Design a protein around this ligand. Structure first.
Ligand code: DGD
Ligand code: CLA
Ligand code: CLA
Ligand code: CLA
Ligand code: CLA
Ligand code: CLA
Ligand code: CLA
Ligand code: II0
Ligand code: II0
Ligand code: II0
Ligand code: IHT
Lengths: 173, 90, 189
């Protein structure tokens, strides 16, 4: 039994294919070390935070909120972080996300006992998982867009490091 | 006398064979010996390189090389785990 | 194997007074009989075969780049490197990367990506050396599906032979550089 993504390599033992986006991709064998539920919860958190970060980088190129342009000047992307650490935006967001992540710590503790699916916060206010096939399709789409947004945020921020422009300022010329 | 308590999941790892069982590696019990040996070589190289970068220590050391210098004592435990997994048929 | 017992495999003896080791088997593509120094006894056979194949494939890419870089240079390479080629180029790329030039980072990019590929393909070595179903050199990389049948066998032979041939060629193309400079086609003519 060889892995589908890497055909010359043996299939990982902790990868069943039951999870969304499972193509059997683990050449370094990380799933043998960690719990797979912990690893999937980490992957979902990294991917969702990266989805919000990618959308935020694009939107902060597109437009700015009222008054932000005087506080930050012309210091787009990660350059605002330091500035807004001098202001109170970053501390406020850190406090509220720390609250949410205390409750996420309780949720992870319940995941590690086998009584919670990884990344399952049961947050579906506008009901979209109304059918068990749309649920699988949305799970695959969430994990794929999370990985894509992880690498997209990496690209946007490191290209900003080289150029100082931004994701859409770079495409402007 | 009274029962001595242990944390949950505590097993008997006493061994008299050539190598210990893989359970003594804890979370690394399922890592193959080749992966352990490769990681030990890589950890030695990275730790030695980072250490040699920070041997003329200044008042502003690079944090990345400071973190990477800790892989040099990690590589010892890695090659011990490599020997254990190699003599455990893994 | 392709012409087994005639071109490769059983019976063939390359050096009659220095027989190859009897530990060296007879069903590896490229076995002609040639191990006069008995160097197959000093290492794992899977490691030796896959090392030979990897050295050969890298040498094949090195010869076909060594000729083409004499023939064709990509647009704008003249601005960074200029009139240098082969052993010089590597050096001055790093020198440019040492100078501060943010556009001469070619060898750092290739060392990054080739090292990542080697790191990710190390478990193929580890499973091959444990008697796994993967044979040395087999990464199952056949996009065009051309060696999908018996045609593979011939190809295997030619691969190792061309690999060995390429392995010699680079060495000439390097040491012939180190005495004179110039390049393979500048040295031929
Ligand atoms: C000197 C030598 C130093 C050399 C350092 C080398 C670094 C390489 C680390 C090797 C790979 C680590 C593998 C890993 O971690 O293994 C994967 C595990 C996941 O393991 C899973 O762990 C499960 C329970 O753990 C989990 O559950 C616990 C309770 O929830 C923890 O809180 C957390 O959730 C998590 O550890 C079970 O054990 C399962 O069997 C297993 O799948 O990750 C964990 O445990 C995640 C939590 C521990 C992270 C450890 C790395 C963090 C570095 C610590 C120092 C920074 C500290 C941060 C503090 C802030 C700064 C001061
Ligand atoms: C990783 C996520 C992330 C992070 C760290 C930041 C960080 C920042 N943003 Mg940004 N932003 C994000 C995502 C993110 N954003 C997204 C997703 C958008 C919309 C596409 C924006 C749009 C945006 C604008 C327009 C502006 C900023 C600005 C800023 C800076 C000041 C803070 C502020 O006013 O934010 C304001 C940001 C918002 C009000 C967006 C909130 C939208 C959230 C993500 C919706 C989440 C709903 C979700 C369903 C609830 C789930 C709860 C729970 C179940 C998990 C700060 C550096 C300002 C700045 O300095 O610009 C240079 C500014 O003008 N952001
Ligand atoms: C519902 C509870 C709540 C309350 C009472 C506050 C209170 C505050 N937030 Mg806040 N915040 C909250 C939830 C809340 N936050 C949540 C859920 C988020 C998203 C995770 C944020 C994200 C956030 C940011 C990004 C910023 C604040 C800021 C502020 C301060 C505004 C100072 C001021 O002049 O106010 C007057 C407010 C007006 C609207 C009038 C003008 C104040 C301490 C700002 C700050 O620190 O200022 C220095 C700031 O930049 N908050
Ligand atoms: C690619 C996007 C995407 C998709 C397909 C999903 C899919 C899913 N999520 Mg999920 N999620 C995402 C992003 C996504 N998520 C992000 C970024 C966060 C962090 C805020 C979360 C947080 C989250 C939680 C906390 C939970 C889920 C849950 C779920 C599942 C329930 C079905 C559902 O509501 O999804 C339907 C989702 C969509 C149809 C996606 C809508 C896409 C919007 C409309 C577009 C956004 C536009 C953007 C804001 C504007 C950009 C501006 C531009 C200038 C850049 C499902 C598998 C729940 C679950 O698994 O249990 C039931 C659950 O508990 N998600
Ligand atoms: C051992 C391999 C090797 C190495 C180390 C180099 C090194 C170099 N080449 Mg070179 N080159 C090679 C092979 C190689 N080449 C091959 C095989 C060709 C085509 C026949 C070329 C064609 C070429 C040109 C035209 C130019 C260079 C140039 C350069 C220099 C700058 C780096 C660069 O942009 O490369 C560019 C290299 C390429 C675009 C070739 C990469 C093609 C790869 C090998 C195809 C692999 C396909 C295969 C299916 C992948 C399998 C992967 C895995 C499954 C095993 C550098 C000294 C430039 C220079 O400085 O000129 C002096 C330049 O202008 N090379
Ligand atoms: C895939 C191979 C490839 C291709 C298609 C091109 C193509 C091109 N390069 Mg180029 N280049 C290559 C490899 C390649 N290069 C390599 C390997 C290097 C060295 C790292 C360079 C370094 C380089 C420089 C320094 C410059 C170009 C530039 C250019 C463009 C105009 C040519 C010119 O003015 O001179 C042209 C589109 C020029 C440019 O920016 O034009 C857009 C330019 O100034 N190239
Ligand atoms: C030039 C000689 C040559 C020959 C005869 C072969 C022959 C072979 N290779 Mg191979 N290979 C070569 C060079 C060569 N390779 C080089 C230089 C590299 C490094 C880029 C590789 C990397 C490589 C991998 C990673 C794999 C193979 C595999 C294979 C086998 C399957 C058939 C195939 O892939 O078509 C070979 C294709 C050709 C001969 C077309 C060459 C294109 C033109 C004619 C050359 C000039 C341009 C076959 C024995 C696969 C295998 O053994 O398992 C199925 C496999 O996984 N090779
Ligand atoms: C699985 C497999 C592996 C694979 C792998 C891959 C390589 C995994 C590597 C993954 C990387 C890509 C993870 C990326 C996370 C991105 C997020 C967390 C960053 C979010 C940005 C932050 C929140 C922000 C910022 C924000 C603020 C502060 C300022 C704003 O002005 C801007 C902004 C809005 C952007 C390998 C190959 C190793 C093999 C192994 O066998 C198994
Ligand atoms: C689930 C929950 C929902 C909620 C929700 C949330 C709001 C859903 C939204 C999820 C959103 C945030 C998805 C974001 C995806 C980012 C994509 C993958 C990436 C692009 C990055 C790559 C391509 C790139 C980059 C590239 C390079 C690097 C650099 C640049 O020069 C160029 C470029 C930009 C092209 C709601 C409330 C609706 C209801 C539901 O009941 C429950
Ligand atoms: C004749 C004969 C036979 C035979 C045979 C034999 C014995 C063959 C012998 C071959 C020899 C002697 C090859 C020697 C070297 C080749 C190398 C290292 C290749 C590439 C080097 C490179 C790229 C380099 C480099 C460099 C780079 C890139 C970076 C620089 O900073 C440094 C540097 C300059 C070092 C057979 C078997 C048929 C039997 C027959 O009866 C007799
Ligand atoms: C906010 C802030 C900051 C910050 C910051 C931030 C926001 C930093 C974010 C960094 C992130 C998200 C980095 C991601 C890097 C991803 C990489 C290298 C992926 C490589 C993929 C590879 C090699 C291969 C991929 C692949 C390929 C092609 C082939 C194989 C398969 C596959 C795996 C698909 C600071 C630090 C500047 C400070 C500032 O004062 C405040």
């Amino acid at each position: 039994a060889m892995s589908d993504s890497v055909p010359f390599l043996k299939q990982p033992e902790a990868l069943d294919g039951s999870m969304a986006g499972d193509v059997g991709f683990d050449p370094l064998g990380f799933s043998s070390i960690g719990d797979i539920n912990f690893l999937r919860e980490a992957e979902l958190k990294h991917g969702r935070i990266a989805m919000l970060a990618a959308a935020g980088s694009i939107a902060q190129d597109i437009f700015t909120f009222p008054g932000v342009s005087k506080v930050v000047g012309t210091a787009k992307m990660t350059g605002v972080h330091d500035i807004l650490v001098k202001q109170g935006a970053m501390g406020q967001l850190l406090l509220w996300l720390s609250f949410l992540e205390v409750f996420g710590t309780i949720a992870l503790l319940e995941t590690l006992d086998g009584k919670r699916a990884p990344g399952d916060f049961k947050f579906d206010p506008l009901n979209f998982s109304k059918n068990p096939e749309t649920f699988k399709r949305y799970q695959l789409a969430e994990i794929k867009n999370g990985r894509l947004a992880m690498m997209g945020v990496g690209g946007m921020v490191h290209g900003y490091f080289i150029t100082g422009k931004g994701p859409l300022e770079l495409l402007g010329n | 006398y009274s029962p001595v308590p242990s944390p949950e999941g505590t097993k008997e790892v006493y061994w008299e064979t050539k190598a210990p069982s893989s359970d003594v590696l804890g979370i690394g019990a399922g890592v193959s010996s080749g992966n352990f040996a490769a990681s030990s070589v890589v950890a030695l190289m990275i730790g030695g390189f980072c250490t040699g970068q920070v041997i003329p220590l200044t008042s502003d050391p690079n944090p990345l090389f400071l973190i990477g210098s800790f892989l040099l004592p990690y590589s010892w435990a890695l090659h011990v785990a490599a020997w254990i997994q190699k003599n455990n048929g893994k | 194997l392709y012409k087994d017992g005639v071109m490769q495999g059983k019976g063939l003896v390359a050096v009659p007074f220095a027989l190859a080791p009897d530990s060296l088997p007879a069903d590896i593509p490229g076995y002609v009989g040639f191990d006069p120094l008995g160097l197959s006894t000093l290492c794992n056979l899977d490691f030796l075969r896959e090392a030979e194949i990897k050295h050969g494939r890298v040498a094949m890419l090195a010869v076909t780049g060594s000729l083409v870089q004499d023939v064709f240079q990509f647009p704008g390479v003249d601005k960074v490197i200029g009139n240098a080629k082969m052993i010089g180029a590597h050096d001055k790329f790093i020198a440019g990367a040492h100078a501060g030039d943010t556009r001469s980072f070619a060898m750092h990019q290739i060392i990054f990506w080739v090292g990542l590929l080697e790191v990710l393909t190390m478990p193929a070595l580890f499973e091959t050396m444990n008697g796994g179903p993967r044979q040395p050199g087999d990464f199952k990389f056949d996009p065009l599906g051309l060696g999908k049948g018996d045609k593979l066998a011939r190809k295997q032979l030619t691969e190792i032979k061309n690999g060995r041939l390429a392995m010699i060629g680079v060495g000439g193309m390097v040491h012939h550089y180190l005495l004179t400079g110039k390049g393979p086609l500048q040295f031929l003519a």
